[PDB]
Amino acid sequence: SIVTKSIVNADAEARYLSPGELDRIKAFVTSGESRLRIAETLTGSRERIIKSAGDALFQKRPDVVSPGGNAYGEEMTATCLRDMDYYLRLITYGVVAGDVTPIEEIGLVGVREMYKSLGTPVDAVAQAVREMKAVATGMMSGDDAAEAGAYFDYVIGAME
Amino acid sequence: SIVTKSIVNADAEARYLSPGELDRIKAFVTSGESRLRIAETLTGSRERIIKSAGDALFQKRPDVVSPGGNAYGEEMTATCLRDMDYYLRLITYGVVAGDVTPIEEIGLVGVREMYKSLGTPVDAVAQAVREMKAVATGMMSGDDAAEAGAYFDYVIGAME
Amino acid sequence: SIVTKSIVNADAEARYLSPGELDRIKAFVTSGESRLRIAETLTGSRERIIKSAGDALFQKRPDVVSPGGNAYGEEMTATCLRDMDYYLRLITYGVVAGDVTPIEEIGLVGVREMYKSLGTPVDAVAQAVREMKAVATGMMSGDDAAEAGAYFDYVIGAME
Amino acid sequence: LRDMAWFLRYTTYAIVAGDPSILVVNTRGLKEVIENACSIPATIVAIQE
Amino acid sequence: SVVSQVILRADDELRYPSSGELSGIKNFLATGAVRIRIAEALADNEKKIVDQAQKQLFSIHPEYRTSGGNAATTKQYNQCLRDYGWYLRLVTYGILAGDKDPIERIGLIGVKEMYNALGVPVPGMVDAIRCLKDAALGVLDSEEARIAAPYFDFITQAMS
Amino acid sequence: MQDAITSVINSADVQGKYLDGSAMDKLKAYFTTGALRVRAASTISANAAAIVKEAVAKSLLYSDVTRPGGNMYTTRRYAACIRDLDYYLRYATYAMLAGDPSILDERVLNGLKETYNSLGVPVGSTVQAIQAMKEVTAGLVGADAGREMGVYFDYICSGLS
Amino acid sequence: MQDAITSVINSADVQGKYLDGSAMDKLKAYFTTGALRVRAASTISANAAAIVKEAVAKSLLYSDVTRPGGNMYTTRRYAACIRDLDYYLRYATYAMLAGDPSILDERVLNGLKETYNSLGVPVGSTVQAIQAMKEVTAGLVGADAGREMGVYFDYICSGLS
Amino acid sequence: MQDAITSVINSADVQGKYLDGSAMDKLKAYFTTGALRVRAASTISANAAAIVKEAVAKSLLYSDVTRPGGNMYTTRRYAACIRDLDYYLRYATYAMLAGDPSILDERVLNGLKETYNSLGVPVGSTVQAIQAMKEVTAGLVGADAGREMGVYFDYICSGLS
Amino acid sequence: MQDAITSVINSADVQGKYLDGSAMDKLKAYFTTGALRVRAASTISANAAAIVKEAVAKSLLYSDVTRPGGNMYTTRRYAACIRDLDYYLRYATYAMLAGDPSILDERVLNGLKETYNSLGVPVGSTVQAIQAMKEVTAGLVGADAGREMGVYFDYICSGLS
Amino acid sequence: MQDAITSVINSADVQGKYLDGSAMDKLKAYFTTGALRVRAASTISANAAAIVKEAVAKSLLYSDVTRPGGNMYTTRRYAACIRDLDYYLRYATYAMLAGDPSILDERVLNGLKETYNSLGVPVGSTVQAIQAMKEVTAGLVGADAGREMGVYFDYICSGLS
Amino acid sequence: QLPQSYFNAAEKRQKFVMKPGLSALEKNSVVKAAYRQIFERDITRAYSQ
Amino acid sequence: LKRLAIAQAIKLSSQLIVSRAANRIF
Amino acid sequence: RMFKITACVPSQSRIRTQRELQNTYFTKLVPYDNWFREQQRIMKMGGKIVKVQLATGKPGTNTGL
Ligand SMILES: CCC1=C(C)/C(=C/C2=NC(=C\c3[nH]c(/C=C4\NC(=O)[C@H](C)[C@H]4CC)c(C)c3CCC(=O)O)/C(CCC(=O)O)=C2C)NC1=O
Ligand SMILES: CCC1=C(C)/C(=C/C2=NC(=C\c3[nH]c(/C=C4\NC(=O)[C@H](C)[C@H]4CC)c(C)c3CCC(=O)O)/C(CCC(=O)O)=C2C)NC1=O
Ligand SMILES: CCC1=C(C)/C(=C/C2=NC(=C\c3[nH]c(/C=C4\NC(=O)[C@H](C)[C@H]4CC)c(C)c3CCC(=O)O)/C(CCC(=O)O)=C2C)NC1=O
Ligand SMILES: CCC1=C(C)/C(=C/C2=NC(=C\c3[nH]c(/C=C4\NC(=O)[C@H](C)[C@H]4CC)c(C)c3CCC(=O)O)/C(CCC(=O)O)=C2C)NC1=O
Ligand SMILES: CCC1=C(C)/C(=C/C2=NC(=C\c3[nH]c(/C=C4\NC(=O)[C@H](C)[C@H]4CC)c(C)c3CCC(=O)O)/C(CCC(=O)O)=C2C)NC1=O
Ligand SMILES: CCC1=C(C)/C(=C/C2=NC(=C\c3[nH]c(/C=C4\NC(=O)[C@H](C)[C@H]4CC)c(C)c3CCC(=O)O)/C(CCC(=O)O)=C2C)NC1=O
Ligand SMILES: CCC1=C(C)/C(=C/C2=NC(=C\c3[nH]c(/C=C4\NC(=O)[C@H](C)[C@H]4CC)c(C)c3CCC(=O)O)/C(CCC(=O)O)=C2C)NC1=O
Ligand SMILES: CCC1=C(C)/C(=C/C2=NC(=C\c3[nH]c(/C=C4\NC(=O)[C@H](C)[C@H]4CC)c(C)c3CCC(=O)O)/C(CCC(=O)O)=C2C)NC1=O
């Protein structure tokens, strides 16, 4: 989170927290209410986000659902929507924590090695998170969509 | 400053600025108006701050002005008030920059070596900044006194 | 090559070439005639290899030539066959050199970054080299097909 | 008599092993161990023989 | 020398030389005059010292003069004598610095590499320096022989 | 190393569940206490050396441990003792800011007992020194900030004992 | 490495003077432009790989440098070229956020000419690539944010040439 | 670290004896099996990632360990699991080439149990993963080369358990 | 670092062309000379110290440079001289095996002139020492192997001068 | 790095001659002055910080260089200036003890001019500071010990200028 | 002191030297060796870190 | 296998090699 | 801030330890904070410093390194 990152960055430097880092933690502490509102917005409507994003993804990239692709069949499409659900859950964690160390430290480090061992195109996963971002920022107000799109932006950036 | 610290901390990590650091820079950018108001408050009344703080310091620590101390005599007391003026100027710089890297990076790194080479008690200098903090936070509103007292607090903490 | 690899591996170890490495270089020196025969087999029939492998690839993976894929259109299909020609040329270089350091050191290091920046599915490129391997090992004798299929095998392995 | 055996032993071990390092790391500093003992060119023509 | 060792060791730990090191410096510099006298006496008689040491060395080892040795031809034999003279010169140098420092720096760091790069055995050099030792000890008294002897034994130590 | 936010996220992730109302309430509790944590951390960063020297002046000075034979006898041992107490105060400040004592058993209490038992450091005397440091900083920052400092000071004393 | 604030403070400190009205006006100018800088930095962080690949698709693709004999020929050279262009875009974003090009000549333009001249890298082709990157990102973020990006892109092209 | 040749030489040297007929017969056995060892090592070097991903697809995928709460859950843990399985296959190839499992207990099985017990890694699930890797590579290289691979795979599973 | 094969492949790749008949003829020339290169490398590996000490006995011994004031005077300087000559013979053997002097100007002749000019090492005396080393090894391995050794020895002497 | 003894031995060795009467007389001169060198070194080791602070109080204090804009302005620059003057006094003590200024141009005056010219350090002001340090220590240790200190102080000022 | 008989009879470690002259995969393998030595495990290719 | 053949030949006849060495040397 | 230094450091210990060779006469960018211990260490080993040049400093600043 923000507090972990500030504590570690002051911790290597053998110093206390600088006052600028302290008002950073203070501003994050005050903005936590809007962060929790964005988290409830993302949590309560996860069904429609995953459904509409999977629909728009398979409309956009039909070869992965065609015979020959990875997510072909009933259980494979269910696992594909499950992976999208995992990434939306990590998006909610990163929205609450105020930083991307939950998202990176859980589901972005060895994502290329894992999806290469599974035989998955990672660009189609980036398109899945892109459609999730489109449905999610179509669901909120302006600054809320920008603050959630920052973390969605980080996930698609960490894909490629 | 805040922008320098965020840029360097993302720069060692070989990554861009995280969105949490970006709203940190955004919140500092919005609070810059109150920072400039605190800076004008500290700048315009520097005469009374230095005068009253020197008076309360020499009342509190009379041995440094007694014969035998460092700041004994006319020019030595003038140099003592000049050193207090230097530290109030660095306080104003740290108030504007939003972080203590002006104060630390100008007048706090080798302060113990310098004041040991001059023969100066550093605790009496900490008392000088304490009286400057008392006069300065007696001069402002509540949150303004807290935000200026953070940097005054950093200077007295970096003394001892 | 083999001589470069043996020289470097003895070079870091601050020693001369061990006699086992020396009979390795000697056996490669004797097998260079069969290597040059495989190279002439691969060089002289490059037209039919590239043509038949492109035909079998677009039969196998028709979505990359369908509108929406990378190699859609006249010049895009020509560039696709040109990339296959590049990889067959590197196969010939690796056949002559006796090791895969020409192939890896020219056209396999940043192949994922390049084909991700172009928007290319790398699995379809692996299928292109697979069809090239099928046509090429359908063109030779048994041990010649095994020795060429080792380098074709390395290229498809370095794709995924 | 033991050393005229032993040279042949580590020759045989080197021949099977494929590297003469087993000979090298032993009979390199061997000379001044046995130079107070005996005649060194006698050992040389012994190994040549 | 002694003062060079004191200065270099004090230069490591970033400090002035302490009182015990300086008092050892004083104790060498007081009795430097006896050293100047014994180096005079070694510089005087060196022809006969090298002469009797050569005679006793080829008493101990007639192997080198005889066929197959290093003292076979008179050019190499003249260099055997010249090596003896250089080593006696280095003994006087080691006496006059008060320590092993210049004699090791000029003639002892890597004698093994040189005399294996040439053909003469190093145990022969051990016996040669011991012959030089009892030769040079017959020309001084005990008050100076106690200063002369252990430099010869240090050469004997660094030979083996 | 995890604060209250990262531990809440780790619990909800090990569940695999979304953030329900109890996690929202825990994060609201941390986001209410965070400003007090910030101000107490600034006040403790103000007076590091004063709190350390008042802790030694309360407990360890004029006792047997600063006399000959004590483990705090020499100037090297005195400087290392001041260093150890500065470490305890600094990491208690970090654990106060995070709101979770995971940094304390990750980075202080990991091999500290075995180090102190190998060196011959008295554990009871340093526990009394940490308790006096806690008493001084609770006199410094007030009642409730002193309590939320003293919970991590008691964590350090419990892991040390 | 200094932003507009640190350079203003450094000028007022090298003077030894307090912050007068001109420094206050400069800092007010930076504190007005900072929100636009933040939003442009977020928009550029959105589309790093797209801006880089559109710059190569505009300038370097289908020319002689991607053909045999060119310095962008091999896959290693292509990957290093994409890496170099990502560096230029990232540091131009940093210099846009700071509002001062000190990071560019501190950390990009320091030994870049001598490196490129030792490797055989064409400087004119990479200057055209940076210019196309500037054109693409100025089409992305608008007129004035594109201009305040293009001033640092022109700084990189001027120091490279 | 010793192959069959070095272990035979070490036995004959610890005896102090010359190489008698039993040692000659052991070395003749190794010099007959060595070409099969070479060809199996080339075939295994061909398909490292395929054998590893087929072992995960047989055992560890779609079970509880890739679900939340499992030790193979996160992408970091998945990448470290693929790394560990690549290590097991690589060192089993080395022990197949040497014809002696001394490298396995020298360099794999040395502190592996204590590492996995400190991390919380399930030993039974990774033993099943190594067994599926053995089954896949024995399907790859044939009957007898698969058997002489499976003896060292069983050595790794026995030292791990 | 590239042999004749890698340089031929690099020329054909920088062209972008396939391996035509001239490249085939160059590789046939290297594959005919390679056995002679192997046997000369074994014969040179046999007598490293003998060739070095015969080169010093021909050129540098009994001259002024081993006398006081010379740069080969002390035992440290003698050992470093033997080390430098062993380096020249070893890298000439490597360049003979590769059939290309790229390793010599990559790893010997890179900063050797500036090192020797900073130390005060005589370049003419070491060039004469390398020439005597060449003469001795050409007496050792024969006419044509001595010539293909002497071309790289002359390369080292030309880059040193 | 060589004292008077090592330089005399090096001259007699580069000659190849034995130690004649002139070398004996030089060593007798050093062995007569050595006790005075020892006592002056102890007296200088007594008052390092006092000599340094009196040199700054004579030359550099209350001038423009401690004012804003000067190179001795900040506390970092003041601490580095005290560090540089302590270096000059310490190495002048070493060169006084050795009786040879070889350590000064080996370890102080090697890259000092280029360092000070790259940093922007005034060389004339630091030469005046070293001269005042020389004046203070010559007032401290007397006439002739002050002279044999001032010869190496003048060596440092000459190599700096 | 370690005898040369002990050093030549030893598991000889490859020393990875970074010269600017080198070929490009050589600088790649040397940087790989530095990532392996400092981070104790190859952190690129196993995490793409 | 050729290295084993020559090693077995050397082992089987080491006694007469050492005896030939014995009357060569002494 | 960084110093683009150029120096030549002979070892004087390779004869005793018998190690392999590192090429001396390097040209490197040293950071400003540890350029001190680096220059001092080059003087400890006895090596001569050829050229010291400030690379990224812009000398005479007070903040911003
Ligand atoms: C929280 C971080 C995290 C992630 C991301 C994760 C992914 C993950 N995805 C899997 C499978 C999968 N994931 C996909 C997903 C996709 N394929 C496509 O074509 C689409 C582009 C895409 C989704 C939109 C598919 C098809 C599989 C099945 C692969 C197979 O059966 O071989 C599996 C193996 C089976 C299992 O245990 O679920 C894991 C562990 N696990 C994690 O812990
Ligand atoms: C901006 C950072 C900065 C600082 C702090 C600074 C201090 C500084 N203080 C000095 C003197 C001094 N400063 C003091 C100050 C004090 N003595 C006391 O007893 C009081 C406790 C205290 C002030 C309230 C005195 C007495 C001197 C004169 C010392 C002497 O004459 O020996 C001097 C030497 C003369 C000069 O050039 O001004 C410097 C450089 N310079 C800097 O650039
Ligand atoms: C010798 C090593 C080497 C390689 C591999 C290489 C590839 C390479 N492929 C390119 C394009 C391409 N390569 C392909 C190839 C394919 N797309 C598909 O769908 C198929 C699966 C596949 C071929 C069978 C396509 C479609 C493009 C055009 C991409 C575009 O126009 O955006 C380009 C950009 C244009 C150019 O300058 O040629 C390069 C540099 N260059 C090299 O130096
Ligand atoms: C300053 C320290 C130092 C010394 C002493 C030194 C000696 C030295 N001795 C040499 C040869 C020699 N040295 C000896 C010496 C001996 N043979 C014996 O049997 C005795 C044990 C021993 C002395 C009595 C002989 C016989 C040669 C000629 C070897 C040859 O045939 O090349 C050579 C080569 C040719 C020459 O310049 O004379 C050097 C450089 N080098 C140095 O740097
Ligand atoms: C952060 C500041 C910074 C920069 C910018 C930087 C650049 C830099 N670019 C390099 C190579 C390169 N740069 C290029 C780029 C180009 N060549 C072309 O033909 C195009 C015109 C142009 C790209 C637009 C290429 C092809 C190489 C590889 C050269 C080679 O491998 O031979 C290298 C050689 C070492 C290595 O690849 O990893 C460095 C150090 N280093 C830095 O620290
Ligand atoms: C060459 C000999 C050798 C081996 C084998 C080795 C293993 C090893 N595996 C590790 C972790 C790991 N190993 C696994 C593997 C597994 N966990 C599961 O759930 C599966 C059952 C199983 C894979 C089949 C995982 C998930 C981790 C990461 C633990 C963590 O990050 O918390 C670690 C922890 C440090 C690090 O990841 O980089 C080591 C040292 N080290 C060695 O030097
Ligand atoms: C592998 C490529 C390579 C080479 C060749 C190399 C040479 C090299 N030779 C050196 C010294 C030396 N080289 C010589 C050699 C000579 N002086 C003479 O008088 C003779 C004419 C000549 C020998 C034939 C000597 C005497 C020194 C020592 C200089 C000294 O200690 O002052 C040094 C100084 C540091 C050290 O000794 O260990 C280097 C780096 N380094 C390398 O990395
Ligand atoms: C042991 C031999 C040796 C010497 C002498 C040496 C000097 C040296 N002095 C330095 C800085 C300095 N030196 C000075 C000194 C002065 N400037 C002034 O205005 C005064 C006239 C003068 C003091 C009397 C200052 C102010 C700096 C800091 C420059 C800066 O921080 O920008 C630096 C820059 C790096 C660092 O501070 O730690 C070096 C390397 N290094 C060495 O290895």
**Alpha carbon separation from G116 to C50, C110, G159, I82 (Å, rounded):** 37, 20, 12, 39
Element (H, E) at M8: strand M2-8
Identify the residue among C153, C154, C159 best suited for mutation to test binding to H, counting H beta carbons within 10 A and taking the highest: C153
CA–CA separation, C140 vs I87, rounded Å?
Answer: 46
CB-CB contact of J31 with E33 (8 Å): yes
CA–CA separation, B34 vs B142, rounded Å?
Answer: 13
CB-CB contact of E54 with E81 (8 Å): yes
CB-CB contact of J13 with E89 (8 Å): yes
CA–CA separation, A148 vs A92, rounded Å?
Answer: 9
Helix, strand, coil share of chain D (percent; to 5): 65, 0, 35
Query: Hey, what are F94's tokens?
Result: 């970090």
CA–CA separation, B128 vs B83, rounded Å?
Answer: 10
- Mark which residues 96-155 of A lie under 8 Å from H by CB: 105-111, 113-114, 116-119
CB-CB contact of J4 with E95 (8 Å): no
How many angstroms from the chain centroid is the CA of residue H51?
13
* Contact call for J19 and E8, based on CB within 8 A: no
Q: Flag whether E131 is marked binding.
A: no
* Contact call for M24 and I111, based on CB within 8 A: yes
User: Helices in chain H by DSSP H: which ranges?
Assistant: 4-15, 21-46, 48-55, 75-98, 102-107, 112-119, 123-141, 143-160
Q: Which residues pair with M8 in a beta bridge?
A: M48
Tokens 């095996």 belong to I97
CB-CB contact of H127 with H161 (8 Å): yes
Element (H, E) at B90: helix B74-97
Q: Which residues contact G130 (CB under 8 A, 6 or more apart)?
A: G55, G85, G88, G153, G156, G157, G160
Query: Hey, what are J11's tokens?
Result: 């001259």
Alpha-carbon gap: K14 to the closest alpha carbon of chain H (Å): 17
Q: Which residues pair with B111 in a beta bridge?
A: none
CA angle F147, F151, F154 (to 5 degrees): 125
Mutate to test the pocket of ligand 7, among I121, I127, I128, I133 (most ligand atoms within 8 A of CB): I121
CA–CA separation, G17 vs K35, rounded Å?
Answer: 49
Q: Which residues contact G96 (CB under 8 A, 6 or more apart)?
A: G37, G40, G41, G44, G148, G149, G152
CA–CA separation, M8 vs M11, rounded Å?
Answer: 10
CA–CA separation, B106 vs J79, rounded Å?
Answer: 12
> In ligand 1, which atom is closest to the CA atom of H78?
40
CB-CB contact of J12 with J23 (8 Å): yes
Element (H, E) at M7: strand M2-8
Query: Hey, what are A119's tokens?
Result: 């035989």
Residue J3 phi, psi dihedral angles, 5° rounding: -85, -165
Whether chain I has a CB inside 8 Å of the CB on C39: the answer is yes
**Alpha carbon separation from C139 to C45, C125, C149, I5, J36 (Å, rounded):** 9, 21, 12, 25, 95
For chain D, the straight-line distance linking the first and the last C-alpha, in angstroms and rounded, comes to 15
In eight-state DSSP terms, residue F65 is G
CA–CA separation, H95 vs F127, rounded Å?
Answer: 54
Q: Which residues contact C59 (CB under 8 A, 6 or more apart)?
A: none
Query: Hey, what are C49's tokens?
Result: 């290899």
Whole-angstrom Cα Rg for chain B: 18
CA–CA separation, E16 vs J47, rounded Å?
Answer: 11
CA–CA separation, H4 vs H120, rounded Å?
Answer: 36
- Touching F: which chains, 3+ CB pairs < 8 A? A, B, H
Q: Which residues pair with M51 in a beta bridge?
A: M6
Q: Which ligand is nearest to the CA of B75?
A: 2
Q: Which residues pair with B68 in a beta bridge?
A: none
CA–CA separation, J139 vs F113, rounded Å?
Answer: 56
Q: Are strands M2-8 and M26-31 parallel, antiparallel or unpaired?
A: antiparallel
Sequence letter at residue G111: G
Alpha-carbon gap: B128 to the closest alpha carbon of chain J (Å): 17
Tokens 């995969």 belong to K25
CA–CA separation, J81 vs J79, rounded Å?
Answer: 5
Chains H and E touch, using 3 or more CB pairs below 8 Å: no
Going by alpha carbons, the residue nearest to atom 8 of ligand 3 is C83
Sequence letter at residue G45: S
Closest CA to A60 of A9, A113, A134, A116: A134
Element (H, E) at J115: helix J112-119
CB-CB contact of F126 with F116 (8 Å): yes
DSSP A12-29: HTTS---HHHHHHHHHHH
Element (H, E) at M5: strand M2-8
> G115-145 b/e with 16+ CB inside 10 Å = b?
ebeeeebeeebbbbbbbbbbbbbbebbeeeb
User: Helices in chain F by DSSP H: which ranges?
Assistant: 4-15, 21-46, 48-55, 75-98, 102-107, 112-119, 123-141, 143-160
Whole-angstrom Cα Rg for chain L: 11
Q: Are strands M2-8 and M48-51 parallel, antiparallel or unpaired?
A: antiparallel
Q: How far is the CA of J116 from the centre of ligand 8 (A)?
A: 7
CA–CA separation, H59 vs H68, rounded Å?
Answer: 17
Nearest CB to M23 within list K7, K15, K19? K19
- Give the total residue count for chain C: 160
Q: How was this structure determined?
A: cryo-EM
**Alpha carbon separation from F18 to A50, A53, A93, A154, I9 (Å, rounded):** 14, 19, 9, 20, 58
Query: Hey, what are H110's tokens?
Result: 């040395």
DSSP H76-89: HHHHHHHHHHHHHH
CA–CA separation, B119 vs B59, rounded Å?
Answer: 21
Query: Hey, what are E98's tokens?
Result: 């008060």
> In ligand 8, which atom is closest to the CA atom of J72?
19
Chains C and I touch, using 3 or more CB pairs below 8 Å: yes
Question: In what order do the strands lie in the sheet containing M26-31?
Answer: M26-31, M2-8, M48-51
Identify the residue among E109, E114, E115, E116 best suited for mutation to test binding to M, counting M beta carbons within 10 A and taking the highest: E109
CB-CB contact of J37 with J96 (8 Å): yes
* Contact call for H42 and C153, based on CB within 8 A: no
CA–CA separation, H76 vs A102, rounded Å?
Answer: 12
HSE-up of residue D9 (Cα within 13 Å, Cβ side): 19
Q: How far is the CA of H83 from the centre of ligand 6 (A)?
A: 7
Q: How far is the CA of G116 from the centre of ligand 3 (A)?
A: 26
In eight-state DSSP terms, residue I142 is -
**Alpha carbon separation from C89 to C49, C139, C151, I15, J79 (Å, rounded):** 11, 16, 12, 11, 65
Query: Hey, what are A9's tokens?
Result: 């960055």
Q: Is E13 helix (H, G, I), strand (E, B) or coil?
A: coil
Binding residue numbers of C: 80
How many angstroms from the chain centroid is the CA of residue G63?
24
Tokens 């007898």 belong to H144
Residue M50 phi, psi dihedral angles, 5° rounding: -80, -55
Strands (E), chain E: none
* Contact call for B117 and J76, based on CB within 8 A: no
Question: From the CB of E76, is ligand 4 less than 6 Å away?
Answer: yes
Whole-angstrom Cα Rg for chain A: 18
Closest CA to E111 of I78, C83, H112: I78
Q: Which residues contact C102 (CB under 8 A, 6 or more apart)?
A: C1, C90, C93, C94, I6, I9, I13
Resolution (Å units): 3.5
Tokens 């008295």 belong to F122
Whether chain K has a CB inside 8 Å of the CB on D2: the answer is no
Q: What is the largest CA-CA distance in chain B?
A: 58
* Contact call for M62 and B4, based on CB within 8 A: no
CA–CA separation, A148 vs A38, rounded Å?
Answer: 7
How many angstroms from the chain centroid is the CA of residue G35?
19
Whether chain C has a CB inside 8 Å of the CB on I28: the answer is yes
Q: Which three-class secondary structure string do you get for I87-135?
A: HHHHHHHHHHHHCCCHHHHHHCCCCHHHHHHHHCCCHHHHHHHHHHHHH
Alpha-carbon gap: J83 to the closest alpha carbon of chain E (Å): 12
CB-CB contact of A155 with A90 (8 Å): yes
Nearest CB to G35 within list B26, B93, B101? B26
Going by alpha carbons, the residue nearest to atom 28 of ligand 8 is J77
**Alpha carbon separation from A69 to A61, A118, G133, I20 (Å, rounded):** 10, 12, 35, 41
Closest CA to H84 of K46, E19, F140: K46
* Contact call for I38 and C19, based on CB within 8 A: no
CA angle K41, K44, K49 (to 5 degrees): 110
DSSP C74-100: HHHHHHHHHHHHHHHHHHHHHHHHSSS
Mutate to test the pocket of ligand 4, among E120, E131, E156 (most ligand atoms within 8 A of CB): E120
CA–CA separation, B76 vs B79, rounded Å?
Answer: 5
DSSP M17-57: H--------EEEEEESSSHHHHHHHHHHTTPEEEE--BSS-
- Give the total residue count for chain L: 26
CA–CA separation, A133 vs A131, rounded Å?
Answer: 5
CB-CB contact of G90 with G44 (8 Å): no
Contacts of A113 in chain K (CB under 8 A): 46-48
Contacts of E107 in chain I (CB under 8 A): 74-75
Label residue E138 exposed, middle or buried (CB < 10 Å: 0-12, 13-18, 19+): exposed
Alpha-carbon gap: K13 to the closest alpha carbon of chain I (Å): 19
CA–CA separation, I38 vs B42, rounded Å?
Answer: 83
E15: left (phi over 0), alpha (psi -120 to 50) or beta: beta
Q: Is J40 helix (H, G, I), strand (E, B) or coil?
A: helix
CA–CA separation, G21 vs G19, rounded Å?
Answer: 7
Nearest CB to I110 within list K21, K23, K26? K21
> In ligand 7, which atom is closest to the CA atom of I91?
1
Q: Which residues pair with M7 in a beta bridge?
A: M26, M49
* Contact call for L17 and D8, based on CB within 8 A: yes
CB-CB contact of A149 with H81 (8 Å): no
* Contact call for G14 and M4, based on CB within 8 A: no
Whether chain H has a CB inside 8 Å of the CB on D9: the answer is yes
CB-CB contact of M41 with J111 (8 Å): no
Mutate to test the pocket of ligand 4, among E70, E89, E126, E132 (most ligand atoms within 8 A of CB): E70
**Alpha carbon separation from M50 to B142, E52, I121, M26 (Å, rounded):** 59, 51, 17, 10
DSSP A74-89: HHHHHHHHHHHHHHHH
CA–CA separation, K44 vs I109, rounded Å?
Answer: 33
Q: Cα torsion at J107, J110, J115, J120 (round to 10°)?
A: 100
Contacts of B118 in chain J (CB under 8 A): 53
* Contact call for H52 and A117, based on CB within 8 A: yes
Determine how many CB atoms are found less than 10 A away from the CB of residue C130. 19
Contacts of A109 in chain H (CB under 8 A): 74-76, 79
CB-CB contact of I28 with I4 (8 Å): no
CA–CA separation, H85 vs F91, rounded Å?
Answer: 39
CA–CA separation, C19 vs F160, rounded Å?
Answer: 60
CA–CA separation, E115 vs I53, rounded Å?
Answer: 11
CA angle E4, E5, E6 (to 5 degrees): 90
CB-CB contact of A122 with A160 (8 Å): yes
Q: Which residues contact G100 (CB under 8 A, 6 or more apart)?
A: G2, G3, G4, G6, G7
Mutate to test the pocket of ligand 4, among E65, E79, E132, E133 (most ligand atoms within 8 A of CB): E79
